[PDB]
Paper text:
Usutu virus (USUV) is a mosquito-born flavivirus that can infect multiple avian and mammalian species. The viral surface envelope (E) protein functions to initiate the viral infection by recognizing cellular receptors and mediating the subsequent membrane fusion, and is therefore a key virulence factor involved in the pathogenesis of USUV. Structural investigations on flavivirus E protein have revealed a strand-dominated fold with three β-barrel domains. In mature virions, E protein assembles, in a “head-to-tail” mode, into pre-fusion dimers, shedding the fusion peptide from premature exposure.
In this study, we reported the atomic crystal structure of USUV-E in its pre-fusion state. To gain insight into the structural features of USUV-E, the ecto-domain region of the protein spanning amino acids F1-A406 was first engineered to include a C-terminal 6xHis tag and then expressed in E. coli. Via crystallization screening, crystals of USUV-E that can diffract to 2.0 Å were successfully obtained via the hanging-drop vapor-diffusion method. Within the crystallographic asymmetric unit, a single USUV-E molecule was present, and clear electron densities were successfully traced for USUV-E amino acids F1-R406 as well as for four terminal His residues of the fusion tag. As expected, USUV-E also folds into three domains (DI, DII, and DIII), showing an extended and a β-dominated structure. The inter-domain angles between DI-DII and DI-DIII were calculated to be 144.4° and 153.6°, respectively. As expected, a head-to-tail USUV-E dimer which resembles previously reported flaviviral pre-fusion E-dimers could be generated via simple symmetry operations. In this dimer form, the highly hydrophobic fusion loop is readily concealed from the bulk solvent by the DIII domain of the other molecule. We therefore believe the enlarged domain-angle between DI and DII in USUV-E is an intrinsic structural feature of this viral protein.
Residue numbers in the entry:
A (entry chain A), B (entry chain A): 0 to 410
């Protein structure tokens, strides 16, 4: 979707009289319709958020195995013990003093030395990757409620071609942007990413079959053996190793148990992510100020359409307290403004309610044009009326509800 | 090998005065010579460890492919979507709600339903098998250092026939055993398998061309799709599947990437094994207590041999600080005890050193018998002397080393 219509995850905001900005929250899967006095209605929504060229920060080991454990030992006065496995970098080595005597095969009594080494291999590891702010693009779609039909309204190519839709990019570095709006002037947008979209606060951690957005502080403080992205030999290998109390000529080295369970429990709350090479960020939101003082209706204005209309599609409930319909216009006098309104009584034509599709018009000079119109009728019974006199058509509508005030369940 | 001689992987233990047991570690490829006061010297070693009738525990999938992905979709009020592929068990199916409207071909606006299915096939799997304790035999060989020759010493048939060798089985269920020792009384042996021989701690995992001894806890916690040995349809197939965000009438289903690399890295430390139908366990060891209070020299004792000896084989270094030789006896007065000793000087015949082949004797009544003798000479110069007076033969020996104490490199 590049527009608000048809979406269930949709909100409506008002640009009230005199307001020069509207504050919005843009989620990955939602859409905002903004209606404002003497301005075209506009939709704004997040289209996509992608981050390219993730860089490794560090990898941690959460299950180690030990192998090839050996101890070199020397009786007192016979020199210090050195384990030759000290040459091989995958071995962790530990020097020690031992009590020696006749009983343990040494002629003299006193301190002997030992040097025990053991081969370190990581069984299970988790990688952390980071996102550079210069490699993040937040794609935002804008739609202007100009003339559309049921066929053209959700067609991006058609809307882009009528200068009624477009796509702009917001970045962590360039969070402000002025977007031209065809014949409607321009808007200015400034956003701040929050939660899952504030990539400065997180790393992507790959564990097992999954990838997770994880808080940087927690990842950095993980007390596990680790490797740098370059020069990969495990550091702090001693965590997960237990050098047991040594005997005179031998020493046992055992791996600690797996920390995988503790890891999974740490990741239970975290948002899973997919394909960390060009990751798609779904969670979180942008907090944006849409400045609209230069958003304007079109300088070229029209007269009213004079010929007759019919309902090409009868009013339908959108689920949002609004109704949408499609008119077909017989006249060839376009472009022209559509004489459509909502009234309480066919005997009293005072307009009530509100048009979502503000200033509806036929765009085409050709006959039989189709125009979609979305409107908010009042609570109770009303009539959608198009035209006047003996060209008038109308359709009754009933909207459930009251003005007392809606309960909400915000998430 | 059923005996210690000729092996490089050999250790010597002492049954000291008053000790009623000796504690030993039996590895798959090593041998222990035990010398003890007023007892025959004995060898003890692991002969084989085999496990029969392994049973499958579970199999895991570490690379899945998806195929025949399809979605059935329904507009609002038109009923719930059901995918008929829900009948076929190899399909994973996922129900969903979608936003519907004119734009996506539905007359009414509201929630439509979808039902997407996809065929699951495992590309690469690993099987885990378990060993019942009742199907494990640890075979242990015992040799008594009775009279032998260079020809008979390593001949099992000859040694079994002289009641100087035998083979007994230790099992996880029956880890204790009393073994008769011919005319030497008996010993009692009790063992505990450790590491690679403690089959209660492991499963055999078949991956690719290889089989590995793997820790049970790690295998059981593997978060991959799995099948029971019976009723084989994959469970937890959803791991390795990604149902992508659905469009109105379509939904993409993709397999996750292979977990083979993570698997190989998990198996890098593990001990490889061969032929898991009757697997041979090589790695690990038995920790055994050899009780020897009823081990005894033979009740039938001999006088000294009176006739002359010659060296059929000159003393040879075994590599263990011991020397082995072969005498040939001219006399027909056997069986008789051999008058052999180690001395510092031919002018002073005080015995020094130690006989590995304790109480050497000629077993045969026939002439020209050959008797192997292994002995530990002191550091420095010494003489091996056989016989007395003008029947005396001797051979000088030099042993490098000192009594200060040997450095060791235990593994």
């Amino acid at each position: 979707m590049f527009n608000c219509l048809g979406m269930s995850n949709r909100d409506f905001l008002e640009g009230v009289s005199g307001a020069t900005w509207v504050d919005v929250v843009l989620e990955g899967d939602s859409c905002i319709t903004i209606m404002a006095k003497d301005k075209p209605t506009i939709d704004i929504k997040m289209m996509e958020t992608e981050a390219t060229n993730l860089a490794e920060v560090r990898s941690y080991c959460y299950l180690a195995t030990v192998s090839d454990v050996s101890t070199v030992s020397n009786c007192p006065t016979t020199g210090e013990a050195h384990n030759p496995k000290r040459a091989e970098d995958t071995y962790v080595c530990k020097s020690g003093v031992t009590d020696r005597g006749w009983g343990n095969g040494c002629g003299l009594f006193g301190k002997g030395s030992i040097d025990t080494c053991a081969n370190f291999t990581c069984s299970l590891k988790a990688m952390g990757r980071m996102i550079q702010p210069e490699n993040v693009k937040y794609e935002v779609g804008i739609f202007i409620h100009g003339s559309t039909s049921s066929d053209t309204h959700g067609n991006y190519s058609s809307q882009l071609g009528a200068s009624q839709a477009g796509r702009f990019t917001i970045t962590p570095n360039s969070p402000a942007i002025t977007v031209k709006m065809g014949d409607y002037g321009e808007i200015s947008v400034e956003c701040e990413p929050r939660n899952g979209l504030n990539t400065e606060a997180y790393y992507i951690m790959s564990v097992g079959t999954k990838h997770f957005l994880v808080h940087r502080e927690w990842f950095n403080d993980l007390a596990l053996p680790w490797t740098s992205p370059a020069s990969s030999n495990w550091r702090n290998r001693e965590i997960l190793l237990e050098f047991e109390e040594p005997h005179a000529t031998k020493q046992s080295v055992v791996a600690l148990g797996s920390q995988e369970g503790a890891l999974h429990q740490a990741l239970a709350g975290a948002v899973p992510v997919s394909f960390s090479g060009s990751v798609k960020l779904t969670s979180g939101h942008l907090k944006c100020r849409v400045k609209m003082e230069k958003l304007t209706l079109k300088g070229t204005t029209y007269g009213m359409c004079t010929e007759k209309f019919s309902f090409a599609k009868n009013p339908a409930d959108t689920g949002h307290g609004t109704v949408v319909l499609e008119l077909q216009y017989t006249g060839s006098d376009g472009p022209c403004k559509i004489p459509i309104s909502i009234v309480a009584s066919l005997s009293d034509l005072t307009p009530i309610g509100r048009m979502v599709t503000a200033n509806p018009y036929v765009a085409s000079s050709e006959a039989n044009a189709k125009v979609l119109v979305e409107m908010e009728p009042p609570f109770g019974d009303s009539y959608i009326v198009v035209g006047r006199g003996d060209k008038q058509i109308n359709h009754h509508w009933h909207k459930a509800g009251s003005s007392i005030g809606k309960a909400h369940h915000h998430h």
